[PDB]
């Protein structure tokens, strides 16, 4: 997943910057 | 920057932070 990404591992500041809709 | 894991809550105010206006959190509803 892309939301699970940031919780399972570390992520960027772009991914979730596009997951706020 | 932080190098930790963000889960169920932080995630919401991470994406909604980018989309957390200029000192806001959410917009359309409450």
UniProtKB/Swiss-Prot annotation, chain A:
Disulfide bonds join 6-11. This is Insulin A chain. It comes from Homo sapiens.
